[PDB]
């Protein structure tokens, strides 16, 4: 199984009442481990997963340093952005940033990432090859030409193919217990009778990790999508995930319906029916 | 491991 690490920054200008609020968070796959809040009392990179506490003071110092520095870098880009886009200084604006790497089952560098978004719109992004850039508009075309002549890509390529993977690897092993585990979905199904000759069969999937899961509603040996009500996967808050898809079903035809649950933590895809 | 990000737009 391929694993991934992502850090996610979020700078928000609050004109005339302080420097922007900067909130960065890091995940390995679907599990988060660190965070940083420009406003929280720590003024340090705080752990979130049990296993990252394992890291020594050197790690925390350097990590704190890097992210604080990033916070400045973007606080200034928030200004640079305004000029490039001829926007007012009294408006509140949002500069989200994302960087990370992927590792294969082997632990080999799979793919790196680095991209910025001003007020929730692709601004600049490092291409798949970590050698050139893709700029959104005439605004980023400036930042692009700047970063081209500074060989910034090279700098980033070095981080992505180096520090980034090295850390992702260390973490997966450090917290092997937690991160490589695959909590299977504890699936059941309940009856919700509605009006006349009609009912609701809610297919439940609870306490599974990771969040990648696919629910199928098949009746009579035939897949059904029209009466399916599948909510976007949701967290449990305990480090697991949840999802349900209901179908409106005629009175007495309940035993003719089956639910197909595919997940990484299962030996084989599950099949569920109305069990009175 | 966080990134060494220091460049300006």
């Amino acid at each position: 199984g391929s694993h991934s690490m992502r850090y996610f920054s979020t700078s928000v200008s609050r004109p005339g009442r302080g420097e922007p609020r900067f909130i960065a968070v890091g995940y390995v796959d679907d599990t988060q481990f660190v965070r940083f809040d420009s406003d929280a009392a720590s003024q340090r990179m705080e752990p979130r997963a049990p296993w990252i506490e394992q890291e020594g003071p050197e790690y925390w110092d350097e990590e704190t340093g890097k992210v604080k520095a990033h916070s400045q870098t973007d606080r200034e880009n928030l200004r640079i952005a305004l000029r490039y886009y001829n926007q007012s200084e009294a408006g509140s604006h949002t500069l989200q940033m994302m960087f990370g790497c992927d590792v294969g089952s082997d632990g080999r560098f799979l793919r790196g990432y680095h991209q910025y978004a001003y007020d929730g719109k692709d601004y600049i992004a490092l291409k798949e090859d970590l050698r050139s850039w893709t700029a959104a508009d005439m605004a980023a075309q400036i930042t692009k030409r700047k970063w081209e002549a500074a060989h910034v890509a090279e700098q980033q390529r070095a981080y992505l193919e180096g520090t980034c993977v090295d850390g992702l690897r260390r973490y997966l092993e450090n917290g092997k217990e937690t991160l490589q585990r695959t909590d299977p979905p504890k699936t059941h199904m309940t009856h919700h009778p509605i009006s006349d000759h009609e009912a609701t069969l809610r297919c439940w999937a609870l306490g599974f990790y990771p969040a990648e899961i696919t629910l199928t509603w098949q009746r009579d040996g035939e897949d059904q999508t029209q009466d399916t009500e599948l909510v976007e996967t949701r967290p449990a808050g305990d480090g697991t995930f949840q999802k349900w898809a209901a179908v409106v079903v005629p009175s007495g035809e309940e035993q003719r319906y089956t639910c197909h649950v595919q997940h990484e933590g299962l030996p084989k895809p599950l099949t569920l029916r109305w069990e009175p | 491991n966080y990134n060494y990000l220091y460049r300006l737009f």
Partner: T-cell receptor
Amino acid sequence: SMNAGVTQTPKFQVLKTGQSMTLQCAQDMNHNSMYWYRQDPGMGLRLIYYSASEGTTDKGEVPNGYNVSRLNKREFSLRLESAAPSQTSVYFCASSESGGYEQYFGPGTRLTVTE
Amino acid sequence: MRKEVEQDPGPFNVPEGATVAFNCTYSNSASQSFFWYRQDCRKEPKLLMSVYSSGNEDGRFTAQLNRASQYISLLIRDSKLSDSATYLCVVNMLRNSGYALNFGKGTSLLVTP
């Protein structure tokens, strides 16, 4: 390039160990980050203070006996409140677009403190 | 003395027209940028050129970075009395909070006719 962007003043100074004194620095290049270094033979450049943005300042490798003030986007002052033989060095100031960017240096200032 | 940038100092007498190669070794693996600086005796440091992995040619001057082995090289062909001066290895890297420039004590060249 005459790098006349960065300007230090004075080029030479001499002091009674008691005396106070302030060196001045200015960059016309519209950089954000300015730095006050101190080149002593057999140790090379060592940073005293710096100023990453227009508003803020921070201590460097050897900020003792020294104090700075980034009065403005262009100007960054180094101030010796009470000179000491110890503080006899060459002092260089420099600016760069932002932190970690190639630094452009002033001509530097030769200061000597005598009992 | 403890130095993240180490540069063999000592005058390096070399004849004019001769090739000179200089090297510099940086400790901190998290170094992000790399530069060569030429400083004339009794004068200020001037950026000579930034050194990149892809390689950096500039006529007489040529410089490479080895991230792997953590060294940078500057090589000057057809050396000239004019380029007699002290060469400073400069690398940026995260000091405290804020990326900052570390300067080598510098190696001093003396081209002679």
